[PDB]
Amino acid sequence: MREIVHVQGGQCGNQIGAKFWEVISDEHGIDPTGTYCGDSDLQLERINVFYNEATGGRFVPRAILMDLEPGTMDSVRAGPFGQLFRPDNFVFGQTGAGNNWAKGHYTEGAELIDSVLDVVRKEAEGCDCLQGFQITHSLGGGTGSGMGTLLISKVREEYPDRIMETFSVFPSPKVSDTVVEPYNATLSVHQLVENADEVQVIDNEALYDICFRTLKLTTPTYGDLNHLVSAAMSGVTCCLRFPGQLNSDLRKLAVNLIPFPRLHFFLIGFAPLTSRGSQQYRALSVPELTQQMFDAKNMMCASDPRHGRYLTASAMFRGRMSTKEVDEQMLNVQNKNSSYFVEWIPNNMKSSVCDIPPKGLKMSVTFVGNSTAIQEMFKRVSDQFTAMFRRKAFLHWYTGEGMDEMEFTEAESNMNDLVSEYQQYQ
């Protein structure tokens, strides 16, 4: 069947996928020791997509844990569901790229990338044919945005036609750590705009904003935020593992969201999200999830969607619902907020109904929207990057270990052409 090979780049991406495999094992009934518990056919008829039989009966994930420092890797193994990963799937780093793009990509990620293409090709060739790879990595660092993007390149000359999905976190708008954020962000963008089939944008200030006035969590931890990302991250790949009335795989999303190959960046939201005082006070049916996914107050990227215009969108429903009030209510949100959708594409948005909800919930949805409103995120990285670059600041921490000047000019020129290809549709 279809298989999705997982890649864990950067220490942020290691903890994001650590909670992701906790979620997938929870809904597939997988013990942390690898045994199966849950005695139902529907959890197991499509388990080869994310798990592999290992002549012990246990299910090892098809995930590569990849980092340049071993501190965050041993945190994965020592934690719960860290017993699940194969020991050979960890690729240890010793020195570590110090939030530095050049060390991640050119000079220090080079001697480790040959060791990880060994295990990527080993898992990929082990099946007859896979669907694609999902890449979880961070853009505010050096291990994630420098070394993970070179992995994105190498698996694309070797596998050209497979779906390159990536869940990527971006620099947050208001306040941030890791002062070389626009340096690692712009240099990761101009490599990833021609080598990634679909990019799903995540902002940590957006994830923080979710927990405050729609979850009422006074103390959200990073395990809280990783489960936010993982809830929609399995919310894209529902129909591969579960049957439904209207199935949709990752390439169904790829072909039916992007009209042009160079623009593929997707705002991601999840629903229903209710607090403790309000779970039992809210109805759970189709008409209020569809208002939830169309809000500026649920979206997991800090780009206000009503500033821009929705080019093409999609919704992956899960659970027991009637397909009719789904069907005309994608219409009903289209025609009341008609100014927020584009005119030269009729009926901008796709549905797909899956029959299996996440556990505890009876029906949910995951929203993937290709909105022009991400232009504000690109232009915010733009004027932050040109403010640093015009004074040559921090530039010897890149140009002195294997790289030169003019690829910075090409980085901001590719990023500016990415900008200019958006307001011509707005």
């Binding site: 809280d224 489960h227 919930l361």
Partner: peptide
Amino acid sequence: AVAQLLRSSAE
């Protein structure tokens, strides 16, 4: 986790 207790909640 609180996210575990919110997202997969049924009671």
